[PDB]
C-alpha cells in the first residue's frame, strides 16, 4: 500500500503468532518490539537513540508479517512505547520512500 | 526521488543558509538537528526517544531545503545522536512510504 505521513505510520504486523501494531520507521536500523515472550535463543544487546540506550533481547530469524507481506529476520525485544519496524525488515518487503 | 532502505536514508539539507546531513525519518514526529545556529526566538521543549527524554530548542517557521524540495516549519535543536527530518517536514515535501 501507500502510507502517508500525516499521522504516525502504524500498521498491523504478526509476530510470534500475535497481531500487533507497529510503526514503519525509516530512522531505525533494527526492529524493536514491546516486551513479548518469544520462543528461542536470545542474546543481550544495547540499542540507542534520543535519550540514551536501553537493553534488549535479540532474537534471530523470527518470521514477521507486515501488512500481509512476509519477512524474516532479527527482532529486538524490550521496553518500548511503540513497536518499531526498522530497515532490516522494511527492505525485505520492498518498502521505499518517495517524493 | 525514490529512496530504498538498504542504507540509512541520509540526505543533504540546507538550513539557515548552511548544509547539513540528515536522516529521512518516518519514525520521528519532529525534525531534530544537533547543536547549531538558527536566528529568531526559540522555546524550550522536551522530546522523547528510545532511551528517554531530552531538552531541545524549538524554532518555528524555519525554511529548510531537503534534496531540492522546500519546506518551512518547526526545527528542534538539541543533543540528538543523528540529525533527523521527521514527519512535520516530510509531509511538506510530499513524502510517502510505499510497498
Ligand atoms: C519510541 C519512540 C519512536 C522511535 C523513534 C526512533 C528514531 O527516530 C531514532 C532516529 C535515529 C537516532 C536519533 N532511531 C532509533 O532511536 C534507533 N537507533 C538506531 O537505529 C541506531 N542508533 C543510533 C544511536 O542512531 C542503531 C545503530 O541502533 C533505535 C530504535 C534502534 C533500532 C524516535 O526516537 N522518535 C522520536 C523522535 C523525536 C521527535 N520529537 O520526533 C519521536 O517521534 N518522539 C515523540 C515521542 C512521543 C511519545 N509520547 C507519547 N506518545 N505520548 C515526540 N514527539 O517526542
In chain A, domain spans: 1-99
The DSSP result for A24-91, as a single string, is: E-TT-SS-EE-S----S-EEEEEEEETTEEEEEEEEEEEEEEETTEEEEEEEEES--SSEEE-HHHHT
Q: Could you tell me which residues are beta bridge partners of residue B98? A: A2, A96
| CB A32, CB A56: distance < 8 Å | yes
Tell me if residue B64 falls in helix, strand or coil.
strand
C-alpha cell at A45: 544487546
Is the minimum CB–CB distance between A89 and chain B shorter than 8 Å? no
The DSSP result for B10-54, as a single string, is: EEEEEETTEEEEEEE-TT-SS-EE-S----S--EEEEEEETTEEE
Distance CA A41, CA B92 (A): 44
Which residues are within 8 A (CB) of A17 and not within 5 positions of it... i.e. 6 or more apart?
none
Question: Greatest CA span in chain B, whole angstroms?
Answer: 41
Task: Determine, for residues B99 and A95 on separate chains, whether the beta-carbon distance falls below 8 Å.
Answer: yes
Ligand 1 atom nearest to CA at A47 = 28
Q: Could you tell me which residues are beta bridge partners of residue B54? A: B47
Determine the Cα angle at B72 with ends B68 and B77, to 5°: 100
Is the minimum CB–CB distance between B38 and chain A shorter than 8 Å? no
Q: Could you tell me which residues are beta bridge partners of residue B82? A: none
The residues lining ligand 1, judged by C-beta closer than 6 Å to any ligand atom, are A 25, 27-30, 32, 47-50, 80-82, 84, 86; B 25, 27-30, 32, 47-50, 80-82, 84, 86
Q: Is CATH 1.10.3720.10 correct for A1-99? A: no
φ/ψ bin of A67: left (φ > 0), alpha (ψ from -120 to 50), beta (otherwise) = left
* Expt. technique: X-ray
Distance CA A41, CA B49 (A): 28
Q: Which residue of A has its CA nearest to B85?
A: A27
Is the minimum CB–CB distance between B55 and chain A shorter than 8 Å? no
Question: Cα-Cα-Cα-Cα dihedral of B76, A6, A3, B50, to 10°?
Answer: 40
The number of C-alpha atoms within 13 Å of B23 and in the hemisphere containing its C-beta is 22
| CB A82, CB A22: distance < 8 Å | yes
Amino acid at each position: 500500500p501507500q502510507i502517508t505521513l500525516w499521522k504516525r505510520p502504524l500498521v498491523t504486523i504478526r509476530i510470534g503468532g500475535q497481531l500487533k501494531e507497529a510503526l514503519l520507521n525509516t530512522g531505525a536500523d533494527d526492529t524493536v518490539i514491546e516486551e513479548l515472550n518469544l520462543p528461542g535463543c536470545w542474546k543481550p544487546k544495547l540499542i540507542g537513540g534520543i535519550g540514551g540506550f536501553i537493553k534488549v533481547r535479540q532474537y534471530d530469524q523470527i518470521p514477521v508479517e507486515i501488512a500481509g507481506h512476509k519477512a524474516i529476520g532479527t527482532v529486538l525485544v524490550g521496553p518500548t512505547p511503540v513497536n518499531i519496524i526498522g530497515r532490516n525488515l522494511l527492505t525485505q518487503i520492498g518498502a521505499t520512500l518517495n517524493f
